[PDB]
UniProtKB/Swiss-Prot annotation:
Keywords: Autophagy, Cytoplasm, Cytoplasmic vesicle, Lectin, Repeat. Ubiquitous. Selective expression by prostate carcinomas versus normal prostate and benign prostatic hypertrophy. A carbohydrate binds at R67, N77, E87. It comes from Homo sapiens. GO terms for cellular component: cytoplasm; cytoplasmic vesicle; cytosol; extracellular space; membrane. Homodimer. Interacts with CALCOCO2/NDP52. Interacts with PDPN; the interaction is glycosylation-dependent; may participate in connection of the lymphatic endothelium to the surrounding extracellular matrix. Beta-galactoside-binding lectin that acts as a sensor of membrane damage caused by infection and restricts the proliferation of infecting pathogens by targeting them for autophagy. Detects membrane rupture by binding beta-galactoside ligands located on the lumenal side of the endosome membrane; these ligands becoming exposed to the cytoplasm following rupture. Restricts infection by initiating autophagy via interaction with CALCOCO2/NDP52. Required to restrict infection of bacterial invasion such as S.typhimurium. Also required to restrict infection of Picornaviridae viruses. Disulfide bonds: none annotated. This is Galectin-8. One of its GO terms (molecular function) is carbohydrate binding. Residues 17-150 form the Galectin domain.
Length: 152
């Protein structure tokens, strides 16, 4: 965790991206993801993970998954011991092919609060303790300009 917090920003990561989060996600922590949905994207996802194991797959405390089929949606879920739980689906989605976005994930004591382009998008209640999250995963069809962290 750099003293100059601007030095913790990750620029132009290759997708698929996996990175260690530089400190624990305590209440008040922000994760800021700037990017662009490329032409013909089907879906992309941001995963807050407990480790980087590929097989068996690392637990995912928070799966945030924009999908571009038909009217579009966002699917949120949690992965434990390689099995998905019950999906929470948001149909009021701000994501579109060939549009830029800024995602802000705010870690609260009880939930994640997600805003896109400065507007509230969704809430996701913690299912796994957020103190187990150490890894950020970005997968699918997206271009990421930058990843930043604001720790309390
Ligand atoms: C019933 O459909 C499933 O809904 C789940 C959420 O409810 C996930 O969205 C899942 O996609 C995935 O399993 C996530 C994915 O695209 O995998 C990429 C990946 C990342 C890390 C390890 C292995 C695969 C999708 O197939
Ligand atoms: Cl940062």
């Amino acid at each position: 965790l750099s003293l100059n917090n601007l030095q913790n920003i990750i620029y132009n990561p290759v997708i698929p991206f996996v990175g260690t989060i530089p400190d624990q996600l305590d209440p008040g922590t922000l994760i800021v993801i700037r990017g662009h949905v490329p032409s013909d994207a089907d879906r992309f996802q941001v995963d807050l993970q407990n480790g980087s194991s590929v097989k068996p797959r690392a637990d995912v405390a928070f799966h945030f998954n924009p999908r571009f089929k038909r009217a579009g949606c966002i699917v949120c879920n949690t992965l434990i011991n390689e099995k998905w739980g019950r999906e929470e689906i948001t149909y009021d989605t701000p994501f579109k092919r060939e549009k830029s976005f800024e995602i802000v994930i705010m870690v609260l004591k009880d939930k994640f609060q997600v805003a896109v382009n400065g507007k509230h998008t969704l809430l996701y209640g913690h299912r796994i303790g957020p103190e187990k999250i150490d890894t950020l995963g970005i997968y699918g069809k997206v271009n990421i300009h930058s990843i930043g962290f604001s720790f309390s």
